[PDB]
Amino acid sequence: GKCRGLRTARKLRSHRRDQKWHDKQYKKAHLGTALKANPFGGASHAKGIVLEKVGVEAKQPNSAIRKCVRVQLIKNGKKITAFVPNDGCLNFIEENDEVLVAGFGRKGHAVGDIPGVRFKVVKVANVSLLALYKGKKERPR
Amino acid sequence: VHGSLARAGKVRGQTPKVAKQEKKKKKTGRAKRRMQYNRRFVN
Amino acid sequence: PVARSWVCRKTYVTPRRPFEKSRLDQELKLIGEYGLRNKREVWRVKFTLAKIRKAARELLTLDEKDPRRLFEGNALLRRLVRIGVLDEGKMKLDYILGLKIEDFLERRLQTQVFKLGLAKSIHHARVLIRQRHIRVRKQVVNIPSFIVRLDSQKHIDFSLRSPYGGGRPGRVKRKNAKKGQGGAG
Amino acid sequence: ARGPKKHLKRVAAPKHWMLDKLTSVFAPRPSTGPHKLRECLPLIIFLRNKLKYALTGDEVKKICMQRFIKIDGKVRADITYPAGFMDVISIDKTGENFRLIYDTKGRFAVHRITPEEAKYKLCKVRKIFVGTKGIPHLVTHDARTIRYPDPLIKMNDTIQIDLETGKITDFIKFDTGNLCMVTGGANLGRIGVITNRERHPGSFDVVHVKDANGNSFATRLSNIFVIGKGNKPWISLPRGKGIRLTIAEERDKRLAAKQSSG
Amino acid sequence: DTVTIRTRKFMTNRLLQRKQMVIDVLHPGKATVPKTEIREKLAKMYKTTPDVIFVFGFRTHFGGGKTTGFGMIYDSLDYAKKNEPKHRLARHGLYEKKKTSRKQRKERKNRMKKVRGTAKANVGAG
RNA sequence: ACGGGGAAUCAGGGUUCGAUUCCGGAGAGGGAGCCUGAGAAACGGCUACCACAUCCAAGGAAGGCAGCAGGCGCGCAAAUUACCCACUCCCGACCCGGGGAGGUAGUGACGAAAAAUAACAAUACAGGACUCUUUCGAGGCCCUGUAAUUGGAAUGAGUCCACUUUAAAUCCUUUAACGAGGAUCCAUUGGAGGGCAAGUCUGGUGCCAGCAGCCGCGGUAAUUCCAGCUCCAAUAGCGUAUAU
């Protein structure tokens, strides 16, 4: 059930150079089409303005209306949905605001009740969203 | 959206706004570990 | 093209399992007994004891009567006996594996000041060295992580400038005499 | 990339110069004298660190220019003049004379010698080179093209030149029963009798050597340098006599003298 | 006084005609006695003038004890004018340098390039 | 994807990374050609062409910051248009001039080593080895949890003169004059359902707000949300995002 020979080092090698492609944890990270469809250019964060403010429901077991934002990036000009993670911190978000967006916490997947949103908002017009909540900073009006 | 986005921070904003009391400065330093060792293994 | 020697490296190891209720419980039993500050003061010792056995083990893999083992091991044994953790004549490059954490902890200056009088509590000795009162046979040192060699084991006394030493009082006593003079008469 | 190199950086420079890492970036680049880089010793480093007569380049700058330094009989005037094997150097103001031969690890140990040994030197040959007009010619380690030698001079030999007019006197042939010191390579600076030269037509001719201490080693013919006849060296040797000691044995010597001179 | 100068690593630089040494101060707790006094005391131990003694680089140790510094002892006042580097000399002051600036000079030689060729054009302007 | 010396991770194998200060190669916006010179197909040298461009009397002239500082644009994202040639060596007709190569400064929580925020005592509570009573009662050498600075000693943070450091100053180091009573000199970042250390505590909210990496909590007693109190993790660091 193996090669195991002593002049076979090439076949053990051109087999594993072939069967690595079926490890989806490796096919994604080593094929140019996986990163291309990423709205980020592989970056950690990406700035971009806010072009509306919309809410999205939750999955079947538990009901709610998660609040979100329709952020358009400036890097690629794409359009993505960004969750606004905080308690009632949709009062500081406004149209044409240039918010900073980060990965949601599952390396390119949804999390929990939120359907189809993989992005959360960390800053809002160059002030930290945590700072606005706890009050340390203040967004000038 | 069906009718949403009207309520946001409904709970944070109607909870009572109670104030805090600052009495003892429990600085960590190292007497913390002196007494944090002396909560467990003194009894 | 700068001079700037950039050689540095960590000296502590983060435990693989963060919460165990038995590693946390026990490590305090070390900090509490020996008057440390934070877990780094313990893991740093775990690292030196890890290295000194990751080095001792490699020699044990090598057979005896060997050019590199016999010298490095004798040299390896030389520092341990010199530092105050192993008995002379208890050197065979095997009891090294029989060492435990506390043996490097017992030899620090902070603990050593406590055992040779010079203080009332193991914590009190620690504040003294940081107030620059204790001199290791010639020089006042304020480093409670000093690891004392055998020569410096019996040469530890108070300084010559300290208020506890043969010097003038500190600021507290000097000021009280002046403040007290108007206080009483 | 476009021509010669005129900046030698730090310990990228040869290791036997005994240099630091935090003396900035560069190192003195020898002036392309009578020896390769990887065998020489800049005259500047012989006056700051090996001797510690001076402090900086400047105090070395003013010494060599004041025309006190004497190398091979005629004074030099460049800060970085390459030194090399079997070179004699003299300091007339203080009154010492140095020999500059390799140690048992390879460091160009400081070696003070008598004025009698400060007259001559020992130089190996590289090719007997009969040239125009039927004139026999030689070449030596320090690029001395000597005309008109003793015809018996063939190869790998050692010559003795008075250091006023060259003019080889008292040569010793390469044989398989004579002392020889190894120069260059990992074996740098050991001494022993040859006892063999196993030829290899078309490659490096490997020369074994047995030491008077009973030990043995081997090198290639290039690294061999003959320094006397029989078991008698023409030159006095430093402490250790160029006899390699294992790091275990060298450890013993360190511990014994401890607390016995300071 | 209690300065208590001590000497180590002494060498007589005949090829420079000076003295090379290490000065080892032992101050029982003071302000690391200045270069003036140590130059004063060292002469009495060496039987010479305080004009010829020059010291450099006192780096005190920890704990207010032994303090180490270097010094060199020449023979002539002339000899210090060619064997001692300049900054070590004005440190007490017998030779103020040419120092005016660098960029002020550097700008000058460059703007000289635009008018170079005529002595009047060069020296007259600036 | 500049290659290599190397780097992170690890039981034995390995997997990933290497623009990055050392060695070697290519280049000065894209290409091509060439003079001087031993050594350039050099661009802080010339010649054209192309794109972008700066003065103009409209006739013409000049340039290449992928050098050190700077600003623009780009972005998730990267320093002050500061000092001099003293150590580093290099260049030159030369112990003597020049060096934004380099050093020195400033910014600097990328990162790494040591290390403050309390120590002591009597106080009155509090335990048990000790003390004596089978037993109650006791008085004492101790460990401490808490509260009064009750009280005298020790100190570094900070100011500030002088010395020391160094071309010139800068910080550490050394001796000054001051400089601690609880908010003085006020410690955080994340949690308390499970994994995973720690509240079946109180007020609010009512499948709402929201939390939650995952299993899941929220419809009147929420151990999970928002807060208060108490405790827990790491401690000048600690969460978040992505690559690994």
PDB file of N, CA, C and O (backbone and C1' of nucleotides) in Angstrom, chain D residues 2-7 9-10 12 23-29 48 56 58 61-62 65-66, chain F residues 21-26 38-43 86-92 95-96 101-102:
ATOM      1  N   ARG D   2      31.497  47.775 -10.670  1.00  0.00           N
ATOM      2  CA  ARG D   2      32.000  48.433 -11.865  1.00  0.00           C
ATOM      3  C   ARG D   2      33.518  48.530 -11.891  1.00  0.00           C
ATOM      4  O   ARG D   2      34.084  48.883 -12.928  1.00  0.00           O
ATOM      5  N   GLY D   3      34.192  48.213 -10.790  1.00  0.00           N
ATOM      6  CA  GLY D   3      35.631  48.292 -10.726  1.00  0.00           C
ATOM      7  C   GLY D   3      36.176  47.712  -9.439  1.00  0.00           C
ATOM      8  O   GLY D   3      35.616  46.771  -8.873  1.00  0.00           O
ATOM      9  N   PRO D   4      37.277  48.268  -8.945  1.00  0.00           N
ATOM     10  CA  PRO D   4      37.880  47.744  -7.718  1.00  0.00           C
ATOM     11  C   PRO D   4      37.019  48.037  -6.504  1.00  0.00           C
ATOM     12  O   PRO D   4      36.062  48.812  -6.555  1.00  0.00           O
ATOM     13  N   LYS D   5      37.369  47.389  -5.398  1.00  0.00           N
ATOM     14  CA  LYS D   5      36.707  47.618  -4.123  1.00  0.00           C
ATOM     15  C   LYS D   5      37.596  48.469  -3.228  1.00  0.00           C
ATOM     16  O   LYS D   5      38.807  48.251  -3.149  1.00  0.00           O
ATOM     17  N   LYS D   6      36.993  49.454  -2.564  1.00  0.00           N
ATOM     18  CA  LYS D   6      37.762  50.339  -1.701  1.00  0.00           C
ATOM     19  C   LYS D   6      37.042  50.614  -0.389  1.00  0.00           C
ATOM     20  O   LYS D   6      37.109  51.727   0.137  1.00  0.00           O
ATOM     21  N   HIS D   7      36.348  49.615   0.151  1.00  0.00           N
ATOM     22  CA  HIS D   7      35.731  49.714   1.474  1.00  0.00           C
ATOM     23  C   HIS D   7      35.574  48.301   2.016  1.00  0.00           C
ATOM     24  O   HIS D   7      34.735  47.543   1.525  1.00  0.00           O
ATOM     25  N   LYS D   9      34.342  46.238   5.189  1.00  0.00           N
ATOM     26  CA  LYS D   9      33.470  46.473   6.328  1.00  0.00           C
ATOM     27  C   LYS D   9      34.002  45.753   7.554  1.00  0.00           C
ATOM     28  O   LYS D   9      35.166  45.350   7.581  1.00  0.00           O
ATOM     29  N   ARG D  10      33.164  45.578   8.570  1.00  0.00           N
ATOM     30  CA  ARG D  10      33.592  44.984   9.831  1.00  0.00           C
ATOM     31  C   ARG D  10      33.771  43.490   9.640  1.00  0.00           C
ATOM     32  O   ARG D  10      34.004  43.042   8.517  1.00  0.00           O
ATOM     33  N   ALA D  12      33.290  40.916   8.629  1.00  0.00           N
ATOM     34  CA  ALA D  12      33.513  40.378   7.287  1.00  0.00           C
ATOM     35  C   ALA D  12      35.001  40.340   6.951  1.00  0.00           C
ATOM     36  O   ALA D  12      35.442  39.494   6.166  1.00  0.00           O
ATOM     37  N   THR D  23      32.832  48.839  16.919  1.00  0.00           N
ATOM     38  CA  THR D  23      33.636  49.951  16.356  1.00  0.00           C
ATOM     39  C   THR D  23      33.064  50.329  14.988  1.00  0.00           C
ATOM     40  O   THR D  23      33.737  50.039  13.977  1.00  0.00           O
ATOM     41  N   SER D  24      31.862  50.917  14.963  1.00  0.00           N
ATOM     42  CA  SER D  24      31.232  51.399  13.702  1.00  0.00           C
ATOM     43  C   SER D  24      31.009  50.284  12.675  1.00  0.00           C
ATOM     44  O   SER D  24      30.491  49.218  13.064  1.00  0.00           O
ATOM     45  N   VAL D  25      31.390  50.526  11.415  1.00  0.00           N
ATOM     46  CA  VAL D  25      31.101  49.545  10.329  1.00  0.00           C
ATOM     47  C   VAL D  25      32.386  49.070   9.640  1.00  0.00           C
ATOM     48  O   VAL D  25      32.429  47.881   9.320  1.00  0.00           O
ATOM     49  N   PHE D  26      33.359  49.944   9.349  1.00  0.00           N
ATOM     50  CA  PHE D  26      34.345  49.529   8.365  1.00  0.00           C
ATOM     51  C   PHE D  26      35.608  49.032   9.050  1.00  0.00           C
ATOM     52  O   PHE D  26      35.793  49.187  10.258  1.00  0.00           O
ATOM     53  N   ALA D  27      36.476  48.418   8.258  1.00  0.00           N
ATOM     54  CA  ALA D  27      37.776  47.958   8.709  1.00  0.00           C
ATOM     55  C   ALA D  27      38.835  48.412   7.719  1.00  0.00           C
ATOM     56  O   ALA D  27      38.541  48.586   6.533  1.00  0.00           O
ATOM     57  N   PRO D  28      40.067  48.628   8.175  1.00  0.00           N
ATOM     58  CA  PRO D  28      41.109  49.074   7.248  1.00  0.00           C
ATOM     59  C   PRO D  28      41.329  48.044   6.155  1.00  0.00           C
ATOM     60  O   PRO D  28      41.411  46.843   6.414  1.00  0.00           O
ATOM     61  N   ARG D  29      41.416  48.524   4.922  1.00  0.00           N
ATOM     62  CA  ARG D  29      41.611  47.641   3.787  1.00  0.00           C
ATOM     63  C   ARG D  29      43.069  47.708   3.375  1.00  0.00           C
ATOM     64  O   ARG D  29      43.505  48.745   2.856  1.00  0.00           O
ATOM     65  N   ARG D  48      47.323  49.941  17.171  1.00  0.00           N
ATOM     66  CA  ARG D  48      46.230  50.290  18.077  1.00  0.00           C
ATOM     67  C   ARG D  48      45.904  49.153  19.040  1.00  0.00           C
ATOM     68  O   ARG D  48      45.782  49.372  20.249  1.00  0.00           O
ATOM     69  N   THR D  56      43.868  55.902  18.672  1.00  0.00           N
ATOM     70  CA  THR D  56      42.997  56.019  17.518  1.00  0.00           C
ATOM     71  C   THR D  56      43.837  55.921  16.255  1.00  0.00           C
ATOM     72  O   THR D  56      45.046  55.684  16.304  1.00  0.00           O
ATOM     73  N   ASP D  58      44.496  58.476  14.451  1.00  0.00           N
ATOM     74  CA  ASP D  58      45.331  59.671  14.416  1.00  0.00           C
ATOM     75  C   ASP D  58      46.673  59.433  15.092  1.00  0.00           C
ATOM     76  O   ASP D  58      47.726  59.698  14.502  1.00  0.00           O
ATOM     77  N   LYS D  61      48.343  57.533  12.912  1.00  0.00           N
ATOM     78  CA  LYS D  61      48.650  58.322  11.726  1.00  0.00           C
ATOM     79  C   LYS D  61      49.957  59.080  11.902  1.00  0.00           C
ATOM     80  O   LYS D  61      50.775  59.154  10.982  1.00  0.00           O
ATOM     81  N   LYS D  62      50.181  59.632  13.092  1.00  0.00           N
ATOM     82  CA  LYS D  62      51.357  60.467  13.294  1.00  0.00           C
ATOM     83  C   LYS D  62      52.605  59.645  13.585  1.00  0.00           C
ATOM     84  O   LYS D  62      53.718  60.118  13.342  1.00  0.00           O
ATOM     85  N   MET D  65      53.989  58.210  10.123  1.00  0.00           N
ATOM     86  CA  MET D  65      54.472  59.314   9.304  1.00  0.00           C
ATOM     87  C   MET D  65      55.718  59.964   9.886  1.00  0.00           C
ATOM     88  O   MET D  65      56.511  60.544   9.140  1.00  0.00           O
ATOM     89  N   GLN D  66      55.909  59.887  11.203  1.00  0.00           N
ATOM     90  CA  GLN D  66      57.138  60.401  11.796  1.00  0.00           C
ATOM     91  C   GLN D  66      58.349  59.554  11.442  1.00  0.00           C
ATOM     92  O   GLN D  66      59.460  59.886  11.868  1.00  0.00           O
TER      93      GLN D  66
ATOM     94  P     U F  21      20.567  43.253   4.038  1.00  0.00           P
ATOM     95  O5'   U F  21      21.876  44.112   4.283  1.00  0.00           O
ATOM     96  C5'   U F  21      21.844  45.521   4.115  1.00  0.00           C
ATOM     97  C4'   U F  21      22.686  46.215   5.150  1.00  0.00           C
ATOM     98  C3'   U F  21      23.499  45.294   6.058  1.00  0.00           C
ATOM     99  O3'   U F  21      24.767  45.885   6.321  1.00  0.00           O
ATOM    100  C1'   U F  21      22.102  46.678   7.365  1.00  0.00           C
ATOM    101  P     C F  22      25.965  45.749   5.261  1.00  0.00           P
ATOM    102  O5'   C F  22      26.458  44.244   5.411  1.00  0.00           O
ATOM    103  C5'   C F  22      27.627  43.922   6.149  1.00  0.00           C
ATOM    104  C4'   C F  22      28.049  42.498   5.902  1.00  0.00           C
ATOM    105  C3'   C F  22      28.276  42.118   4.449  1.00  0.00           C
ATOM    106  O3'   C F  22      29.551  42.496   3.969  1.00  0.00           O
ATOM    107  C1'   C F  22      26.919  40.488   5.471  1.00  0.00           C
ATOM    108  P     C F  23      29.758  42.852   2.418  1.00  0.00           P
ATOM    109  O5'   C F  23      29.569  41.460   1.671  1.00  0.00           O
ATOM    110  C5'   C F  23      30.595  40.481   1.700  1.00  0.00           C
ATOM    111  C4'   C F  23      30.271  39.305   0.817  1.00  0.00           C
ATOM    112  C3'   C F  23      29.862  39.624  -0.609  1.00  0.00           C
ATOM    113  O3'   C F  23      30.957  39.919  -1.458  1.00  0.00           O
ATOM    114  C1'   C F  23      28.379  38.030   0.292  1.00  0.00           C
ATOM    115  P     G F  24      30.797  41.002  -2.635  1.00  0.00           P
ATOM    116  O5'   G F  24      29.853  40.292  -3.700  1.00  0.00           O
ATOM    117  C5'   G F  24      30.322  39.193  -4.465  1.00  0.00           C
ATOM    118  C4'   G F  24      29.215  38.541  -5.256  1.00  0.00           C
ATOM    119  C3'   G F  24      28.414  39.444  -6.177  1.00  0.00           C
ATOM    120  O3'   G F  24      29.075  39.722  -7.396  1.00  0.00           O
ATOM    121  C1'   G F  24      26.946  38.049  -4.973  1.00  0.00           C
ATOM    122  P     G F  25      28.769  41.086  -8.185  1.00  0.00           P
ATOM    123  O5'   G F  25      27.290  40.892  -8.744  1.00  0.00           O
ATOM    124  C5'   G F  25      27.020  39.953  -9.773  1.00  0.00           C
ATOM    125  C4'   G F  25      25.557  39.919 -10.137  1.00  0.00           C
ATOM    126  C3'   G F  25      24.963  41.213 -10.664  1.00  0.00           C
ATOM    127  O3'   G F  25      25.204  41.379 -12.049  1.00  0.00           O
ATOM    128  C1'   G F  25      23.502  40.222  -9.069  1.00  0.00           C
ATOM    129  P     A F  26      25.264  42.845 -12.693  1.00  0.00           P
ATOM    130  O5'   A F  26      23.745  43.321 -12.716  1.00  0.00           O
ATOM    131  C5'   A F  26      22.812  42.774 -13.637  1.00  0.00           C
ATOM    132  C4'   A F  26      21.464  43.443 -13.513  1.00  0.00           C
ATOM    133  C3'   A F  26      21.483  44.963 -13.574  1.00  0.00           C
ATOM    134  O3'   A F  26      21.331  45.415 -14.907  1.00  0.00           O
ATOM    135  C1'   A F  26      20.304  44.256 -11.648  1.00  0.00           C
ATOM    136  P     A F  38      43.859  54.544 -19.245  1.00  0.00           P
ATOM    137  O5'   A F  38      43.312  53.140 -18.738  1.00  0.00           O
ATOM    138  C5'   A F  38      43.723  51.928 -19.355  1.00  0.00           C
ATOM    139  C4'   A F  38      43.291  50.737 -18.540  1.00  0.00           C
ATOM    140  C3'   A F  38      41.796  50.632 -18.288  1.00  0.00           C
ATOM    141  O3'   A F  38      41.145  49.922 -19.327  1.00  0.00           O
ATOM    142  C1'   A F  38      42.968  50.419 -16.244  1.00  0.00           C
ATOM    143  P     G F  39      39.593  50.165 -19.652  1.00  0.00           P
ATOM    144  O5'   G F  39      38.842  49.769 -18.306  1.00  0.00           O
ATOM    145  C5'   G F  39      38.777  48.418 -17.871  1.00  0.00           C
ATOM    146  C4'   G F  39      38.173  48.323 -16.495  1.00  0.00           C
ATOM    147  C3'   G F  39      36.859  49.060 -16.323  1.00  0.00           C
ATOM    148  O3'   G F  39      35.762  48.282 -16.750  1.00  0.00           O
ATOM    149  C1'   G F  39      38.317  49.651 -14.571  1.00  0.00           C
ATOM    150  P     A F  40      35.047  48.611 -18.143  1.00  0.00           P
ATOM    151  O5'   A F  40      34.226  49.924 -17.818  1.00  0.00           O
ATOM    152  C5'   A F  40      32.982  50.155 -18.449  1.00  0.00           C
ATOM    153  C4'   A F  40      31.927  50.524 -17.449  1.00  0.00           C
ATOM    154  C3'   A F  40      30.578  50.853 -18.063  1.00  0.00           C
ATOM    155  O3'   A F  40      29.551  50.484 -17.148  1.00  0.00           O
ATOM    156  C1'   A F  40      31.439  52.771 -16.975  1.00  0.00           C
ATOM    157  P     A F  41      29.052  48.959 -17.092  1.00  0.00           P
ATOM    158  O5'   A F  41      28.632  48.654 -18.594  1.00  0.00           O
ATOM    159  C5'   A F  41      27.307  48.911 -19.044  1.00  0.00           C
ATOM    160  C4'   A F  41      27.170  50.300 -19.606  1.00  0.00           C
ATOM    161  C3'   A F  41      25.768  50.679 -20.076  1.00  0.00           C
ATOM    162  O3'   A F  41      25.575  52.080 -19.869  1.00  0.00           O
ATOM    163  C1'   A F  41      27.261  50.875 -21.864  1.00  0.00           C
ATOM    164  P     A F  42      24.718  52.616 -18.620  1.00  0.00           P
ATOM    165  O5'   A F  42      25.807  53.228 -17.634  1.00  0.00           O
ATOM    166  C5'   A F  42      26.628  52.370 -16.855  1.00  0.00           C
ATOM    167  C4'   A F  42      27.170  53.042 -15.619  1.00  0.00           C
ATOM    168  C3'   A F  42      26.225  54.016 -14.918  1.00  0.00           C
ATOM    169  O3'   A F  42      26.242  53.802 -13.513  1.00  0.00           O
ATOM    170  C1'   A F  42      28.295  55.079 -15.402  1.00  0.00           C
ATOM    171  P     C F  43      24.852  53.663 -12.724  1.00  0.00           P
ATOM    172  O5'   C F  43      24.321  55.159 -12.615  1.00  0.00           O
ATOM    173  C5'   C F  43      23.323  55.650 -13.495  1.00  0.00           C
ATOM    174  C4'   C F  43      23.768  56.922 -14.169  1.00  0.00           C
ATOM    175  C3'   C F  43      23.521  58.228 -13.431  1.00  0.00           C
ATOM    176  O3'   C F  43      24.505  58.476 -12.438  1.00  0.00           O
ATOM    177  C1'   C F  43      23.029  58.455 -15.757  1.00  0.00           C
ATOM    178  P     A F  86      38.093  65.634  13.030  1.00  0.00           P
ATOM    179  O5'   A F  86      37.650  65.157  14.479  1.00  0.00           O
ATOM    180  C5'   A F  86      38.606  65.031  15.517  1.00  0.00           C
ATOM    181  C4'   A F  86      38.210  63.956  16.491  1.00  0.00           C
ATOM    182  C3'   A F  86      37.871  62.606  15.884  1.00  0.00           C
ATOM    183  O3'   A F  86      39.023  61.828  15.627  1.00  0.00           O
ATOM    184  C1'   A F  86      36.180  63.227  17.408  1.00  0.00           C
ATOM    185  P     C F  87      39.074  60.863  14.349  1.00  0.00           P
ATOM    186  O5'   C F  87      38.625  59.452  14.932  1.00  0.00           O
ATOM    187  C5'   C F  87      39.384  58.814  15.947  1.00  0.00           C
ATOM    188  C4'   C F  87      38.540  57.859  16.747  1.00  0.00           C
ATOM    189  C3'   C F  87      37.932  56.701  15.974  1.00  0.00           C
ATOM    190  O3'   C F  87      38.826  55.622  15.802  1.00  0.00           O
ATOM    191  C1'   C F  87      36.264  57.723  17.286  1.00  0.00           C
ATOM    192  P     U F  88      38.960  54.928  14.367  1.00  0.00           P
ATOM    193  O5'   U F  88      37.460  54.564  13.970  1.00  0.00           O
ATOM    194  C5'   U F  88      36.993  53.223  14.005  1.00  0.00           C
ATOM    195  C4'   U F  88      36.137  52.914  12.803  1.00  0.00           C
ATOM    196  C3'   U F  88      36.804  53.158  11.462  1.00  0.00           C
ATOM    197  O3'   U F  88      37.529  52.025  11.021  1.00  0.00           O
ATOM    198  C1'   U F  88      34.661  54.183  11.489  1.00  0.00           C
ATOM    199  P     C F  89      39.055  51.794  11.454  1.00  0.00           P
ATOM    200  O5'   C F  89      39.735  51.240  10.130  1.00  0.00           O
ATOM    201  C5'   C F  89      40.188  52.118   9.111  1.00  0.00           C
ATOM    202  C4'   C F  89      39.113  52.405   8.095  1.00  0.00           C
ATOM    203  C3'   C F  89      39.569  53.129   6.841  1.00  0.00           C
ATOM    204  O3'   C F  89      40.101  52.246   5.869  1.00  0.00           O
ATOM    205  C1'   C F  89      37.650  54.197   7.724  1.00  0.00           C
ATOM    206  P     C F  90      41.236  52.746   4.848  1.00  0.00           P
ATOM    207  O5'   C F  90      40.422  53.599   3.782  1.00  0.00           O
ATOM    208  C5'   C F  90      39.333  53.019   3.084  1.00  0.00           C
ATOM    209  C4'   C F  90      38.602  54.037   2.252  1.00  0.00           C
ATOM    210  C3'   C F  90      39.466  54.982   1.444  1.00  0.00           C
ATOM    211  O3'   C F  90      39.975  54.392   0.265  1.00  0.00           O
ATOM    212  C1'   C F  90      37.747  56.199   2.504  1.00  0.00           C
ATOM    213  P     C F  91      41.395  54.860  -0.315  1.00  0.00           P
ATOM    214  O5'   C F  91      41.066  56.236  -1.040  1.00  0.00           O
ATOM    215  C5'   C F  91      40.005  56.312  -1.976  1.00  0.00           C
ATOM    216  C4'   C F  91      39.727  57.730  -2.398  1.00  0.00           C
ATOM    217  C3'   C F  91      40.941  58.598  -2.653  1.00  0.00           C
ATOM    218  O3'   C F  91      41.576  58.329  -3.886  1.00  0.00           O
ATOM    219  C1'   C F  91      39.389  59.808  -1.369  1.00  0.00           C
ATOM    220  P     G F  92      43.174  58.198  -3.934  1.00  0.00           P
ATOM    221  O5'   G F  92      43.664  59.703  -4.071  1.00  0.00           O
ATOM    222  C5'   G F  92      43.087  60.566  -5.039  1.00  0.00           C
ATOM    223  C4'   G F  92      43.486  61.995  -4.794  1.00  0.00           C
ATOM    224  C3'   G F  92      44.913  62.193  -4.319  1.00  0.00           C
ATOM    225  O3'   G F  92      45.831  62.235  -5.394  1.00  0.00           O
ATOM    226  C1'   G F  92      43.441  63.400  -2.921  1.00  0.00           C
ATOM    227  P     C F  95      52.449  63.506   4.630  1.00  0.00           P
ATOM    228  O5'   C F  95      51.417  63.207   5.806  1.00  0.00           O
ATOM    229  C5'   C F  95      50.729  64.276   6.447  1.00  0.00           C
ATOM    230  C4'   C F  95      49.888  63.804   7.606  1.00  0.00           C
ATOM    231  C3'   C F  95      48.965  64.867   8.196  1.00  0.00           C
ATOM    232  O3'   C F  95      47.739  64.281   8.632  1.00  0.00           O
ATOM    233  C1'   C F  95      50.495  64.128   9.851  1.00  0.00           C
ATOM    234  P     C F  96      46.357  64.679   7.909  1.00  0.00           P
ATOM    235  O5'   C F  96      46.343  66.273   7.923  1.00  0.00           O
ATOM    236  C5'   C F  96      45.548  66.982   8.869  1.00  0.00           C
ATOM    237  C4'   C F  96      45.507  68.468   8.595  1.00  0.00           C
ATOM    238  C3'   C F  96      44.910  68.873   7.252  1.00  0.00           C
ATOM    239  O3'   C F  96      44.278  70.147   7.385  1.00  0.00           O
ATOM    240  C1'   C F  96      47.164  69.577   7.360  1.00  0.00           C
ATOM    241  P     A F 101      24.351  59.661   2.957  1.00  0.00           P
ATOM    242  O5'   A F 101      25.590  58.667   2.908  1.00  0.00           O
ATOM    243  C5'   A F 101      25.956  57.920   4.057  1.00  0.00           C
ATOM    244  C4'   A F 101      26.993  56.874   3.740  1.00  0.00           C
ATOM    245  C3'   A F 101      27.341  55.940   4.885  1.00  0.00           C
ATOM    246  O3'   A F 101      26.409  54.887   5.037  1.00  0.00           O
ATOM    247  C1'   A F 101      29.327  56.732   3.889  1.00  0.00           C
ATOM    248  P     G F 102      25.358  54.910   6.247  1.00  0.00           P
ATOM    249  O5'   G F 102      26.260  55.150   7.534  1.00  0.00           O
ATOM    250  C5'   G F 102      27.009  54.087   8.101  1.00  0.00           C
ATOM    251  C4'   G F 102      28.011  54.593   9.104  1.00  0.00           C
ATOM    252  C3'   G F 102      27.455  55.096  10.426  1.00  0.00           C
ATOM    253  O3'   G F 102      27.178  54.068  11.352  1.00  0.00           O
ATOM    254  C1'   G F 102      28.988  56.659   9.590  1.00  0.00           C
TER     255        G F 102
END
